[PDB]
Symmetry: C2
Subunit: 343 residues, 2 copies
Amino acid sequence: MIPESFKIDRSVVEEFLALDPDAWERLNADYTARRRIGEACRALSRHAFVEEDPSALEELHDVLALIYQQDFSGAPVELLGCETQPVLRDIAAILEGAVLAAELDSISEEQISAYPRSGKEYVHWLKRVIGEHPAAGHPFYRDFVPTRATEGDFRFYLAQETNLDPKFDDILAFMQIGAAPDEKMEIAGNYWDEMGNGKPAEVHTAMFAHALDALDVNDDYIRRNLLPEAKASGNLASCLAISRRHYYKSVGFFGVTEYLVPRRFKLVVDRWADIGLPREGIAYHDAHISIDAVHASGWFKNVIAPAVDRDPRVGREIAVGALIRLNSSQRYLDSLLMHLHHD
Amino acid sequence: MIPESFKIDRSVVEEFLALDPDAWERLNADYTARRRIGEACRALSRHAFVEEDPSALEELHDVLALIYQQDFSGAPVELLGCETQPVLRDIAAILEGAVLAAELDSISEEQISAYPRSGKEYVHWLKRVIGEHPAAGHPFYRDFVPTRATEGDFRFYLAQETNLDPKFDDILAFMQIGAAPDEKMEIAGNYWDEMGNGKPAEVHTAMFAHALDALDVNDDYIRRNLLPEAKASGNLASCLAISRRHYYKSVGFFGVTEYLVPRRFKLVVDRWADIGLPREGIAYHDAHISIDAVHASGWFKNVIAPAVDRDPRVGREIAVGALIRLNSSQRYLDSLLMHLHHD
Ligand SMILES: [Fe+2]
Ligand SMILES: [Fe+2]
Ligand SMILES: [Fe+2]
Ligand SMILES: [Fe+2]
């Protein structure tokens, strides 16, 4: 299969996904080919995060995005017999470990150690910590959107947001696997809300797609305009949700998400109305402004506080996940605003 | 780490799960140790399914059960930094492939090819096919339970059923990842029912635990009395749920489950009452007798029929998953009844 040391990129992984079931079985039996895949991933990781080559960084997130696509998407009939896990999980573990190591390089021990070791108190501490971060009040939402954002700006912004919102329901489904009762209940009700409480017209992914349609945020536009930090943001969300061991990070990552949505979406929706854009986008953001004040409150009170009270050691992991969401959001919004300013 | 060809068993995998994060990283970097793990798994698989050694078969399912435990359980604080996926996913892929190959050895092409290629028609065909299988009317439920079953019999039976019911909610959560809209909606509502529609007292795992408590089906009793086919049954459910590519098999596997629960549980509940057992076990089984007539109807009409109508090629996979549930159930119930007769 792989008779030499090679370079790995998205096209290489696409070739893998075109293999037939017997070819996959032969690849899985060849630990020499698999060692070469792993060594190639470690080389890509060095280029991306040690050398910080922007081309390698985007290539690494393109690779991870392709794998998470397999983890999150309904499998196609042609791929049903293909055992992709031995190779794809090795690639993902290597590139994920590099992505997470780089996030942690921006997180100091002093930020994640002085938390109160009980639940209600921890929530006050975390909200304060979130409020210290600039991503909690980023000028893209506070200044650019109310004063300048055009339809073309919103189209480009929505293209970036496809990294996350279209898979919120399955992120929650992954997160709640094996969760303790109080935490599981709260995540379950959040998921049921994402599922429109049983009404197909109120399913959040369906409503989000209508906002995309309203501005012709089509698949090809998305592919051409997705920023590297949008890809990283989407890959972080997937990485944390699909491993049990990242659950507490995930609790902080999506806790920040729920907490911040109402103020951000209120600014988007007011400007959207001000410039006469269609009502479909009003619908998706309108829902969340009210819904996510309740989701955020429930998340702090019924996921974060019980987990800390059960084992306060997890307060460190939750704070790490919160800071990862904030840092990655900041890089995403700064990159977004920089690109929007240029136009 | 592994300086020689070795034999793999549950204790070996427990040693892995005791490694620290650095030890895991060193193991993951050593594709020679990893080749030896894979070769050891292929040897265990041959002993279990070619030679059909009963000791090796139980060892293989003990190993898979330990891995799925990691996939399904809230991760412990001590394991949060350990990258278990490269080794554990290779072990699971090898042993799973052997488990599934053995199931398929009992399924002929003529059983899974003559289905009608439209949804409503496919449902009539599948119900007929299910009714031809002896597991659909097994004498454990039809004859032994109404006429003979004692409290000790129910205690032993419930110990076997811990392979499945205590993780139904997360099986559904795994299954619905990436599912098309109609199928996703139905699975989502089923999951919400498992979650007591938001009421903690009506959560199904909680109600199941009370039935276990009613007969002191404690963890140590379960460990000592779990039959090899109970382990295989539980591992099949996990295997099919956690891989996207097994979704359509999973649709048939748990479709059979919902379809068959009301007749089986009605017999259990009537005998339970007849011999004066506590009301807690009445509660869990009482719920499902009515609930699962609705779940089965919804599953056929809103999961199975839409999937066949979208792509009738999936009718073959659904029929395979149905037959895997029926065949594995038969082996489980025959083994159960044989053991109960001996006492
Ligand atoms: Fe939402
Ligand atoms: Fe929400
Ligand atoms: Fe249930
Ligand atoms: Fe059910």
